[PDB]
Design a protein around this ligand. Structure first.
Ligand code: MG
Ligand code: MG
Ligand code: MG
Ligand code: MG
Ligand code: MG
Ligand code: MG
Ligand code: MG
Ligand code: MG
Ligand code: MG
Ligand code: MG
Ligand code: MG
Ligand code: MG
Ligand code: MG
Ligand code: MG
Ligand code: MG
Ligand code: MG
Ligand code: MG
Ligand code: MG
Ligand code: MG
Ligand code: MG
Ligand code: MG
Ligand code: MG
Ligand code: MG
Ligand code: MG
Ligand code: MG
Ligand code: MG
Ligand code: MG
Ligand code: MG
Ligand code: MG
Ligand code: MG
Ligand code: MG
Ligand code: MG
Ligand code: MG
Ligand code: MG
Ligand code: MG
Ligand code: MG
Ligand code: MG
Ligand code: MG
Ligand code: MG
Ligand code: MG
Ligand code: MG
Lengths: 70, 87, 116, 101
RNA sequence: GUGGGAGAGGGUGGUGGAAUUCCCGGAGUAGCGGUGAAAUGCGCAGAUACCGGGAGGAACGCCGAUGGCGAAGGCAGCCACCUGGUCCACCCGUGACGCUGAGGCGCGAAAGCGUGGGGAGCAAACCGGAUUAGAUACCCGGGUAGUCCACGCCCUAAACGAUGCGCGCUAGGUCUCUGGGUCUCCUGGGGGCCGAAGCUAACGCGUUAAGCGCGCCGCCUGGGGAGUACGGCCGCAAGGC
């Protein structure tokens, strides 16, 4: 099972405007992924958190989606 | 807040010799600066209790350095209290 | 006699009942059914079998309008949350995509004592 | 003064007279608050994540600045009065924490 | 002092999505609801389920932890501003300026009181439906205060680590949050588990001591009567010490 940062470049964890990267951290549903998947560190994760929620408010990143298959 | 610029300007005007950062004088001044800022902050915002506690803490520290001073050099203290507007 | 081609099927399943409503590609319904629509009355309304019967029923009624392709939307939980989609597939409605939409709050409302 | 990124998001369907006009009044807003402009990024059209003002997309600008801190709030309220401005975010800049660094 | 940091610490304004309720609208019948089974209840004045729009209040899913912050009560969307505490490194300044702390003064979950707003959902009292030998109860349906905001009182609690504060001393191993380093590791500062010596009535505690010491405050002296009586103080009251 791939972690996220396992496959990714040298990338800004700050920047709330870059979607192409930030999306790679959410499930099918708009949910932020746990460490267990994002392979982040403590403070790493925790910054990611905020930078996403800024993205969300800006409407570049979704608050939720719906489950397919099922 | 207090930027470096303003803070430094204080230490320069409070120092006994060039480069002293640590005299009773310097500490009492600096303290008092932060004190008065805190007063203006709680003259609005009276509903902020935690900062207020911080201010009692500080106020006390000032009083202790003062009481030391007055114990040691009564003159430095008379003067310093004077140029500071206290009592 | 709307003559409705393809469309969507909502399954609202609960612990006391299951209900199925069928609709057009913009969301206006066509027919519907529930467990008490068919004869059942009490607790019996929340069997899986109920969920079946209703799904089917709603389907028969939909094929009445000429329904074929169905895109499914599921909300809630209960037995025959699943038996509904199972006898929805067996119906003869060829099912395009299942989706679970079951809505949840981001936390605003206090719940009933029943609930916490 | 301190460094703030600004973002403005407005209705896609504006023509040129309109779009350039909202830009002008935005400028006049920054000026009128003492906002100095360090640089600008204009993406414009982007397909949103969820609809905003019944709109599947939005129009995006980003303005980095330096400006007084008693202002930055009221600054943002005037920026937002505009009917055709859907979102206003203002954030003080931060240096780029890097991961997979 | 200088430089570096982490944080649901506080106060103030803005602002975002999900959800509940309600109003409007389309489409569409005969039920929905709820239970152990039921019934009240809502529904042909068109409910429920589905779609579109609006209004309002409250609370912040995932991230989230066996996590962080705070003296404590406590503190979670996002943003800006005002502000508190605190950790590290550098070894620069002052030169014992220290610890504790009876009174005092300030803070102090919830419920509660006053005045004025607000009221989605929940909901003491209450109104009903059931269950039962009866039901004032558990379960169901409604529902007022309240819950929310401003201001002013109230001062309690399993206000719990049931463990007063500060300092020095006394094997380790392990997990972790946050600094610094020549970054298998090491070195500060928090958080947890196991465990040396030791302590303990046992349970347990064990560099986050309940061990070895010192300073200072608080407190105890069989159970009931009783946190009662009386007196005093405080309180609008409830009532508190
Ligand atoms: Mg039922
Ligand atoms: Mg009830
Ligand atoms: Mg607007
Ligand atoms: Mg500093
Ligand atoms: Mg905070
Ligand atoms: Mg804050
Ligand atoms: Mg708010
Ligand atoms: Mg209607
Ligand atoms: Mg009936
Ligand atoms: Mg009727
Ligand atoms: Mg009737
Ligand atoms: Mg709606
Ligand atoms: Mg209203
Ligand atoms: Mg959780
Ligand atoms: Mg702490
Ligand atoms: Mg607690
Ligand atoms: Mg600070
Ligand atoms: Mg030295
Ligand atoms: Mg000397
Ligand atoms: Mg209180
Ligand atoms: Mg209260
Ligand atoms: Mg009241
Ligand atoms: Mg209710
Ligand atoms: Mg009754
Ligand atoms: Mg009875
Ligand atoms: Mg007391
Ligand atoms: Mg003792
Ligand atoms: Mg340890
Ligand atoms: Mg390191
Ligand atoms: Mg440790
Ligand atoms: Mg142990
Ligand atoms: Mg032993
Ligand atoms: Mg120790
Ligand atoms: Mg000790
Ligand atoms: Mg003991
Ligand atoms: Mg006795
Ligand atoms: Mg009592
Ligand atoms: Mg007496
Ligand atoms: Mg009395
Ligand atoms: Mg009296
Ligand atoms: Mg009492």
């Amino acid at each position: 099972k791939a972690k996220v940062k396992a496959t990714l470049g040298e990338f800004d964890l700050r920047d709330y405007r870059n979607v192409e990267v930030l999306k790679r951290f959410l499930s099918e549903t708009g949910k932020i992924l746990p460490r267990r998947r994002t392979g982040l560190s403590a403070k790493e994760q925790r910054i990611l958190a905020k930078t996403i929620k800024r993205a969300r408010i800006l409407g570049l990143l979704p608050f939720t989606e719906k489950l397919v298959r099922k | 807040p207090i930027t470096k610029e303003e803070k430094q300007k204080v230490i320069q005007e409070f120092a006994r010799f060039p480069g002293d950062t640590g005299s009773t004088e310097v500490q009492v001044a600096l303290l008092t600066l932060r004190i008065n800022r805190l007063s203006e902050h709680l003259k609005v915002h009276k509903k902020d209790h935690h900062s207020h506690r911080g201010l009692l803490m500080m106020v006390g520290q000032r009083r202790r350095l003062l009481r030391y001073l007055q114990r040691e050099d009564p003159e430095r203290y008379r003067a310093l209290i004077e140029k500071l507007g206290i009592r | 006699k709307r003559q409705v081609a393809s469309g969507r099927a909502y399954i609202h399943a609960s612990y006391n009942n299951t209900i199925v409503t069928i609709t057009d590609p913009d969301g206006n319904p066509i027919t519907w059914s529930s467990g008490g629509v068919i004869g059942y009355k009490g607790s019996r309304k929340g069997t899986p079998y109920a969920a079946q019967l209703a799904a089917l029923d709603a389907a028969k009624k939909a094929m009445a309008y000429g329904m074929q392709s169905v895109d499914v939307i599921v909300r809630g939980t209960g037995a025959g949350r699943e038996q509904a989609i199972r006898a929805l597939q067996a119906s003869g409605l060829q099912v395009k995509s299942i989706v679970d939409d079951t809505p949840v709050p981001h936390n605003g409302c206090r719940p009933k004592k029943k609930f916490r | 003064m301190r460094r703030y990124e600004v973002n403005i998001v407005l209705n896609p369907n504006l023509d040129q007279s309109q779009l350039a006009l909202e830009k002008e009044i935005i400028q006049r807003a920054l000026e009128n608050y003492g906002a100095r402009v360090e640089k600008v990024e204009e993406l414009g059209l982007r397909r949103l994540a969820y609809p905003i003002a019944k709109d599947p997309q939005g129009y995006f600008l980003w303005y980095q600045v330096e400006m007084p801190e008693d202002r930055v709030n009221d600054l943002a309220r005037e920026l937002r009065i505009r009917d055709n401005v859907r979102r206003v975010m203002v954030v003080k800049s931060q240096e780029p924490f890097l991961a997979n660094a």
